[PDB]
Subunit: 351 residues, 4 copies
């Protein structure tokens, strides 16, 4: 009997082949930030208010115009068909059924349209401004046609972080899986090898402004841990900021997103929504993020680990667990809406 979200990592570690579990579970180098992404939540306590009528909890929120059932969303991860045959189809169905947003990786094993064919649902598309700006365009288009509503642009990955497990595992994408967003596209004449060499080391904020010249979809600038870049993201025309450290997969010894969050929220000055991912496993984590000023969180690994465990039902139970846990956190904190989740409902180390 699985009772918390973290237990799916343990199950996925048993069930998956080492190189796949590692590929997902990996953080950069000595995985300090990966641990810190979890540990830092445990250095924030609650300051609950009691004896408040919490019989009607509303955790529903609006994200870039779209109403969703909870401030708990799915972050993009690569190649989900290594975890489970359905892969991103199951994620889409689960995310649609949960009434929340799913971000799809450009490195997904299922295309935007494949995911869209599972049924209606609000979905964002994770991108890099790759070197081949025509390929970036095609992807964007492909996403717009598939009914995707925003672009989570990765901005902390001019180069890939050193996840040493992969080198030690000789990590190769399995035989019958492809990066389906790049299939059928004009690449200018191995696809994983292609996209890896396509990650652009030269990106500036002008390239974020450029991304806005090829799509009218709101741009979530994804991977901002500093108030300095939080400011620049607003000025660059970002629809929102995801305080992400790429699941601690890029630069290690970068702060946890929870430490980083409040600096970014304040720097954004309410001009745009500030989301978080990295180390959210508990409903208490969701709350803490929101009390620090986040507009909602994404989960990455729990989706792939639970997908690996129980398929769609695994992702269903992760969203449901986080939901129930978060509703209970709200109840036991005295919060009947997300607006009622205030800074005074928590205390951090760094107060």
């Amino acid at each position: 009997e699985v009772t918390n979200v973290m237990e799916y990592e343990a199950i996925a570690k048993k069930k998956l082949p080492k190189m796949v579990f590692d590929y997902y579970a990996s953080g950069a180098e000595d995985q300090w930030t990966l641990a810190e992404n979890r540990n830092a939540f445990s250095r924030i306590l609650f300051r609950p208010r009691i004896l408040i009528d919490v019989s009607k909890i509303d955790m529903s929120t609006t994200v870039l115009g779209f109403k969703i059932s909870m401030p708990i969303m799915i972050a993009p991860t690569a190649m989900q068909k290594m975890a489970h045959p359905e892969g991103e189809y199951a994620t889409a169905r689960a995310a649609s059924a949960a009434g929340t947003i799913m971000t799809l990786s450009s490195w997904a094993t299922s295309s935007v349209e494949e995911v869209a064919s599972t049924g209606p649902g609000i979905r964002f598309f994770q991108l890099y401004v790759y070197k081949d700006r025509n390929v970036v365009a095609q992807l964007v288009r492909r996403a717009e046609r598939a009914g995707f509503k925003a672009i989570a642009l990765t901005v902390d990955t001019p180069r890939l972080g050193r996840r040493e497990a992969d080198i030690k595992n000789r990590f190769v994408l399995p035989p019958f899986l492809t990066l389906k967003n790049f299939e059928g596209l004009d690449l200018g004449k191995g696809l994983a090898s292609y996209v890896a060499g396509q990650i652009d080391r030269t990106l500036s904020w002008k390239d974020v402004q450029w991304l806005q010249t090829i799509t009218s979809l709101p741009i979530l600038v994804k991977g901002v841990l500093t108030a300095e870049d939080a400011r620049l993201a607003v000025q660059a025309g970002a629809a929102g900021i995801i305080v992400s450290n790429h699941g601690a997969r890029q630069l290690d010894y970068v702060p946890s997103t929870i430490m980083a969050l409040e600096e970014v929220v304040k720097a954004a000055q309410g001009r745009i929504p500030v989301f978080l991912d990295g180390g959210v496993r508990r409903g208490t984590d969701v709350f803490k993020a929101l009390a620090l000023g986040a507009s909602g969180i994404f989960i990455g690994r729990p989706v792939v680990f639970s997908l690996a465990a129980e398929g769609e039902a695994g992702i269903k139970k992760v969203l449901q667990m986080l939901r129930d846990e978060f509703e209970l956190t709200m109840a036991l904190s005295g919060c009947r809406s997300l607006n009622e989740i205030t800074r005074n409902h928590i205390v951090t180390e760094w107060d």
Copy 2:
């Protein structure tokens, strides 16, 4: 040979069935606060005064008018007949013999009158303002008739905390045990299932004020970790405040009651007594609580664990150990009365 209170948990873990030990030992979720309830005592040091005549130690105190032999009382816990055949009878006899107060859970396996039939003793009755306000009335009445002197109203449990062991253990109350306070009552036509669905998610402070319209017994508002609600408890007409985090069984990542205590004591402004429970195992813990300004502490789990171990004699030895340990702490601190236990006799992390 058992020499400290904590050793009864180890013995109870060996002796009990997993689901019963867990049921009692459980904290909410990743049991962070459960650990913190103990660990936080170890981040408070003593500042003992020496060469004071400590041959006559008086630890006797008065709690809501009633003289007791020590500021160490028994907190309410559910269904003690899972731990040991005698259950709450043994707790009552032990608490009477120790000359201290016992709080009985509404979820006890023995009724208020059953407990009262063991002999004379000062006893409080733990309650929820359940949805069926008529049932709450009957319980209150039943307690008053049984010679119970106060109501510890639980106020941090509009919904039950997620103690995952129970879900993983498929926790069912054993065959011949019942919640005896609810037996013989008009329930308006499984009792554990009933009372679980009776925990009221809608309670406000008006319902605390309502509890005072059906009993003249002093109301200990139980589960206040904030100065904000400490203030509201005074204004609501509480006879006292128990700084409790429900043995870390409700919201996890709530502060330890020892961190929380001093904020609550100060907020109460001496208008009412402020008690503590959660993580008291040592006489040094009792002292530390008292030096932070508590009027006395309750112990929960040590009672059920020692009951599980050695029956009544186990609870006898827990009270006696805590007593002797606390008398010695007082001696070695230079404190010959509870009034002589001052803030300057300790130092915390947070000074």
Copy 3:
């Protein structure tokens, strides 16, 4: 090959019977302060000065008028003949040979005169102001006749701390050992049982002043962790203060003597010398104590553990190791005398 002092504890644990090792090694309750006595040294760093001629290191000091070869002395411990047949004879010979002071416990297995018969040496006598003030007198006399030069009066032990190992081990003094300072004395008509019941719970500072009416020997008030009592010790007529926590054997959760030291040194205002014991195993510990303002340290357990290990040679090597280690600490810190050991040569957590 034994290379540090701590290694003698490991050897003594192997070699001794459990109840004897425990008796010595025991701290009070959950042995928090016992650990802290060591750990706290590791939260003080050095601020060494380099390129200073350290070819001539003088660690010689004067303690209550007596010149000694180093600020590293032997603290009193009970019944050393449980550790090794020679017991306190070996300690005396070792302490004489090292040119340092040895404090003898009133609970020693060898009398003051027995110890004195090993040869010349500077020695202090540890006392309690026991209930039978005539017995205290006789002991004092006995010490003066044996050529003992000061009284280390224990002042943190109105009652014995709860060292649980002893209760769990059913700790009895071996058959042919006695408390030899009490042998041949008028006890007013088991000796361990006697002296245990003689520890006086009523002592005030007036009884310290009383001790000064029966001896002209300087009184080291032993067991002061507070500036408040450091002040009172000066006013009471103490020749010095030993910042001791009874090897963490009395009140647990009392601060380490190293945290406590600087508060006591400052409170004493240079009027009297302030010594330390508790958790000194390294020459770096000796330095740190001295830089915090101590006039010298005592070691307790290392003496009995090394005695248990290698007899007199064990205590010889402990003193020699601490010495060499301390000379090297002095060299590598830039300190050629104890006067040159300054506060700026260290940094603590609490600066």
Copy 4:
């Protein structure tokens, strides 16, 4: 597959004889500072700037006039032929090929000229001002003739630190190895025993000034952890300061060089370059050192451990790994030159 620098320690521990691994791996006493040299890097986080064109990273720097490919250099270590037959030859070839500086120990198993015969390369010579000032002269000369460009004078070793493993291992230099810098020199009529007795306990800053009377080569004063001595090093005529704690091999409980670094950099006031060694294993460590104001770092043990592992190729891969890791740290921090590595790119505990 080796993926980080630390993994070479594990391999060297397997491969080497205990006394050799220990000899190298040893820190002083309880190896607190040795751990701290690593651990302290993990208490400094990054504050990366994103979306900066990092396609052209320049980590090239100038050290005492000499252009080198990176701010990552080789610290001197003794007797490298115990690790691997080639020993310091392999280090020289690797350091030449990496386009960085190698410091050679006076206690090397290969002479300055032997090392110089591997091919061209920028190299410093580590010295003690030994008691026999004529021997120091000869060494200096020997280094100048071998094309060595600076003297790293050790200044934290008036006496050797107590590395207990060596005493426990009965550490002897193997049969056919010698301290080749002392071979062929006029010693005034065992060489390891000789040089050990030659370490001068009397050195002052006047002896640093004296070293400058026998060579015009720039003097790196090596082993300064204090602003006080950082100041004195400038005044003494040092070409630079290496904030080193002798790989935590001298005084234990000395601060990590990373804690110490910023105090020394500020005290030097930009008058001379301030380098660091001790606990650099990651490119992130290199960055952190540089952001604290270091002009470049040296690595000691990784060279001998990787030499022990894979010979020259091992040292090649350590330099290459640190390089690649450091280039990536620079990329992911937004730093395209070492000048662009600023204090604001990190945050420590002690800010």
